[PDB]
């Protein structure tokens, strides 16, 4: 219940206990696709193929770590609370019930490194969370 | 056969904003014509609305006012008077658009003591018009052209003796019709198709399911009737007057169903507007909890049968009823991206079903062939997060775009073999036979198991899933076979023809023109061409034919937007046949001409009312392929023919149309995004990245102007990507179910509120970014809009 | 005990039925879906033998399906399970009349054979 | 008094072991599933020879709600 | 928007007896998804249930 209460207005999402019951977390399946640098020397980087990764524009590159950076889930969402599979309810109450046994699987919200940031606007610290969902 | 009607299949969709031209949007003519306009408005505006008012005002107005004013004092009023108000009113011509009785009401309360009551008026006028249409989903209309032939050669002039008489029929039989569970022809013996391959029912991927009676309270053939709503109307040239098409639920308690409106200009031509969006229930407790099969409901969705009589001065009298001459109009949900086409349309649909599976390897394909299938995924990012941050093939197509290397993929020489094939193995093959094990071989337990990613049914089993081991194919769009965990048709594939060009492309096997290439550099570039390329084709009746379902979408089926599965089988058609490239050395998947099977009795045929007993099930199916069956009268469309598959009331369809969640949260996978959003890039944001740090406004970007241009211009760009990234839930776009305090929210209050909300449901409008800078941004950018959205 | 005018006039058409827990896929994986168990008991003892399986098959329940007992005499008695059924989360409620997923109950079913082993050979 | 009859099930003689003991038709069972079981050659004729479980495995999972 | 309601209807007969009828029942949401599924206390209903004033005027032939 300590979560996201809607406005009829969009915007600001008004949310209850954030630092604690995180609302809006940036995933590990995020991190995975912003942390490497374009120098990087890895099969895949930041969730491209090598080849791919070095042939596009630095500028490119860095965008698609921000757009990566930028993406937020719904920390609800790091576990199954009841809205997953064909027409599944989903909804506040299936929460609270799936809650007494997902507590333990949603996102834990760790600081992590970008060695490498260069000029794509990511700080040097973000804070990554991390589940089985989550994860890609 | 000298007079046809085109398109063949006319397309009007629903909308809650008014049926005049100026308000109104028209179904496309010409394919990809406006993909990057950025003034379309989709919704009313307040500038439109104010327009109309003042040329509502024209002229003899503003004189009456001022003179029943001067008439008004010599008494000092005060108010105005019935038969006073009642002059006004009517000359105003506004009562088409909002109720007599609320135009006088309106004034009856002002209070006055010039050219200045006027604005007292024309301010009260403003809001009560403003109330019903302000920011209404614009109605989009189609125009339906006669055209002689010799075989079609211009549209038909008229002379000042001619006249030509439309006459439409109508009906909904949703409430009549059976339950959709999937669809029938997933077990139906094949040869295979351009559409379906014959793995799906030899292999038993996806089995259909037996679908029993919506409102199986009501029996007997006759008594069912009652269930089925149908209207007609007849304009011709000499009039346009617009005619309702206007009938009632349950047939002749009993509400007006408003199917839709025709009006006819004097060149001939005839305009179809569909209903208002307006889906009821008989008894309010009664709650559409069912994506598609909710009894005790009637929806203003319907199809039916277009005609026409051409009367020459002469008296030469040509009747376009035959099914090679006539059309069909069906009306559909709205279209809520526009300018972001599905990536296989029903045009792909009518193209692939007069192809035979055995003979797609004898296919040529040029580049046009492909290009709509890389355009579309690359487009889908506006309306899907999988497409937006998910998908390895719309970033190496974003990769070459940032060296304008994009020519790359239209060479068909050896060294560029390895990128060609990279692109196409990341895609699902629609022979459903890769990356599956098979089960039990021999044994009635004979099944093609996935070993890729699942979509698991709600019903979960607290027992370990079986990990994957190959990687999930694109798109990442579920399937006809949904309802099956483990099935491969559980996720989208684009059709055995249009995987073949794509299997042609990735070989070599392919041609392009040079002239093609030196448009290239970039995948905007080509497709800004390949638009002029259509906008100049000579065939304008095979282009709107064309244009007409190119905005449709040809899967998944489950029962899918606005048609489903019958149409995706050459039996529904009297006709179709290629006639051409788009252009004499561009294909562009070609133009054909092709027809609906129709009954020639229309309302009247001894089949507009036939079931199948207390199921339906796919050997009614196979039955109706002989002609002189019992059944074969599923392929002849009478009028509510093809829309009675579909979800009632739509509103439920709708809702349901949206993300399917998958343990693993990425990628998203979504149902129709193209046509039913599913991430938007809502206003609010699109006003926190339009603009540059040197724009003059004293708000820039949501900051003020003052704390804009004191941060870096590094750090401001930065801050125009974060914004341009946030994508918003479409549903949550308006109050569907999850606002308030302890809101429950959920998949059921979707479905419930969609009847209501669908009006105020963002809208998605191609706006333009003037500078974007090094930001990343592109130039034209897909905004959804709605009240919630800003 | 059924007349052929059902099937002949269509009166109640047999409608199709999908699996039960379909999310568990392949036939190897669905054998963990099923509670079996089996005895013996003779004439010698009359101990009672439990019918005792597991659910998902070898978290993980016990099942007793049932007992078994032989007298002297040689007659078996056959005891059912004690009425038992459970979902492998509680939060799984059984609210369609028969089709549930994640439930077991311990109903069964079975083949029933003996040996007379006589005092000669 | 409707007479007394002898009568006694087809069964597979491997029960638990035998190698239709988790028989299926894949995604969905219809009625011709069943027409091809009535062919006693056929790969659908099992459907009638039981191993243990063929009798209860048809009726509501739990019973309670069957019997609610 | 704008529902109307029958709160009552009143009669006079000719002896000066005052008749007052109630409404006919109706209840309704402005919205048909408000279901009313608590006892008491339903958002978005009204019912023509009714309670008020009753006076009168005698005025006799005198004056
Ligand atoms: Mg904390
Ligand atoms: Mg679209």
Not at chain 2, 537 to 566: I, K, M, Q
Not at chain 2, 625 to 652: C, E, F, H, V, Y
Request: charged content about 20%; overall charge negative.
């Amino acid at each position: 219940s300590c979560q996201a209460v809607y406005t009829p207005e969009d915007f600001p999402i008004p949310s209850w206990w954030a630092a604690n019951l995180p609302v809006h977390v940036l995933p590990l399946a995020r991190y995975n696709k912003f942390k490497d640098s374009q120098s990087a020397d890895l099969p895949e980087i930041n969730g491209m193929t090598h080849s791919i990764a070095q042939g596009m524009s630095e500028e490119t590159f860095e965008h698609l770590r921000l757009e990566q950076f930028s993406q937020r889930l719904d920390w609800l969402h790091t576990a199954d609370l009841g809205f997953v599979g064909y027409h599944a309810e989903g909804g506040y109450t299936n929460g609270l019930i799936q809650m007494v046994s997902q507590w333990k699987n949603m996102a834990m919200v760790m600081a992590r490194p970008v060695e490498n940031p260069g000029s794509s606007g990511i700080p040097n610290v973000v804070y990554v969370a991390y589940s089985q969902a989550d994860k890609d | 056969c000298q007079y046809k009607i085109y398109p063949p299949l006319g397309i009007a969709r629903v909308g809650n904003g008014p049926a005049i031209k100026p308000l109104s949007l028209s179904t496309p003519e010409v394919p990809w014509a406006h993909l990057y306009d950025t003034n379309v408005q989709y919704l009313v505006t307040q500038q439109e609305l104010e327009q109309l008012l003042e040329e509502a005002f024209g002229g003899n107005v503003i004189n009456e006012i001022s003179q029943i004013k001067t008439k008004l004092d010599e008494r000092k009023a005060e108010k105005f008077k019935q038969e006073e108000i009642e002059t006004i009113t009517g000359l105003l011509g506004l009562s088409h658009l909002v109720p007599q009785q609320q135009l006088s009401r309106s004034l009856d309360n002002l209070e006055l003591k010039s050219d200045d009551i006027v604005q007292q008026i024309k301010g009260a006028l403003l809001k009560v018009l403003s109330d019903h249409y302000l920011h209404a989903v614009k109605k989009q209309a189609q125009n339906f052209y006669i055209y002689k032939c010799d075989n079609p050669v211009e549209k038909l002039k008229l002379t000042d003796g001619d006249k030509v008489t439309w006459r439409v029929e109508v009906a909904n039989k949703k409430s009549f019709w059976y339950d959709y569970n999937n669809a029938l022809d997933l077990s139906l013996h094949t040869q295979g198709s351009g559409n379906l391959s014959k793995n799906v029912s030899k292999h038993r991927l996806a089995p259909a399911m037996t679908a029993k009676r919506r409102n199986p309270n009501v029996i007997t053939n006759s008594l069912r009737k009652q269930l089925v709503i149908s209207s007609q109307g007849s304009v011709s040239s000499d009039n346009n007057t617009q005619v309702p098409l206007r009938g009632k639920f349950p047939a002749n308690e009993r509400h007006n169903v408003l199917q839709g409106s025709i009006e006819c200009d004097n060149e001939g031509v005839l305009r179809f507007y569909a209903g208002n969006g307006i889906s009821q229930a008989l008894s309010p407790s009664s709650l559409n909890t069912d994506f598609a099969d909710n009894s005790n409901w009637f929806d203003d969705i319907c199809d039916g049968r277009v005609t026409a009589v051409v009367e020459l001065k002469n008296g030469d009298t040509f009747e376009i009823q035959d099914e090679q001459s006539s059309a069909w109009v069906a009306t559909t949900p709205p279209d809520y991206a526009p300018q972001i086409e599905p990536i296989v349309t029903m045009y792909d649909m009518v193209s692939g079903a007069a192809l035979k599976e055995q003979d797609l390897d004898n296919l040529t394909t040029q580049f046009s062939d492909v290009f709509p299938i890389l355009y579309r995924l690359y487009r889908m990012q506006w309306v899907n997060q999988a497409d937006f941050t998910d998908n390895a093939v719309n970033t190496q197509i974003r990769e070459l775009n940032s060296e304008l290397g994009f020519a790359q993929l239209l060479d068909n020489s050896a060294s560029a073999k390895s990128l060609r094939e990279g692109i196409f193995n990341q895609f699902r093959n629609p022979l459903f036979d890769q990356d599956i094990d098979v089960d039990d071989p021999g044994q009635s337990s004979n099944e093609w198991v996935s070993n890729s990613r699942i979509i698991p049914s709600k019903d979960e089993t607290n027992i370990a899933a079986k990990p994957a081991t190959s990687s999930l194919k694109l798109p990442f769009y579920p399937n006809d076979g949904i309802d099956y965990p483990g099935s491969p048709v559980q996720w989208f594939a684009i059709p055995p023809f249009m995987y073949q060009h794509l299997q042609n492309w990735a070989a070599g096997d392919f041609s392009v023109t040079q002239v093609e290439k030196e448009s290239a550099n970039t995948i905007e570039e080509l497709g800004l061409f390949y638009s002029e390329q259509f906008k100049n084709s000579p065939n304008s009746a095979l282009l709107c034919a064309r244009g007409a379902l190119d905005a449709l979408y040809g899967g998944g089926f489950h029962p899918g937007v606005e048609l489903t599965w019958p149409m995706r089988h050459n039996l529904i058609y009297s006709q179709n046949d290629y006639v051409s490239s788009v252009t004499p050395e561009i294909n562009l998947l070609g133009l054909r001409e092709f027809r609906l099977k129709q009954d020639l009795q229309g309302l009247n045929s001894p089949n507009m009312y036939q079931d199948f007993g207390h199921v339906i099930a796919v050997d009614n199916v196979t039955a109706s392929i002989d002609p002189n069956s019992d059944a074969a009268w599923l392929w002849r469309s009478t009028p509510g023919d093809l829309t009675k598959w579909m979800g009632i009331p739509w509103q439920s369809n709708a809702a349901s149309c949206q993300a399917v969640y998958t343990p693993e949260d990425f990628p998203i996978p979504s149902w129709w995004a193209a046509n039913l959003p599913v991430h938007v890039l809502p206003l609010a944001r699109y006003n926190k990245f339009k603009d540059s740090q040197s724009a003059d406004l004293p708000e820039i970007n949501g900051m003020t102007h003052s704390i804009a241009q004191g941060m870096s211009e590094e750090t401001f760009e930065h801050l125009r990507l974060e914004q341009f990234s946030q994508r918003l839930d479409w549903l949550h776009t308006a109050d569907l179910g999850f606002v308030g305090y302890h809101a429950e929210g959920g998949y059921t209050n979707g479905l419930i509120q969609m009847v209501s909300q669908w009006k105020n449901m963002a809208m998605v409008m191609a706006r333009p970014v003037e500078n974007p800078g090094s930001s990343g941004i592109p130039n034209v950018v897909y905004v959804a809009y709605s009240q919630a959205d800003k």
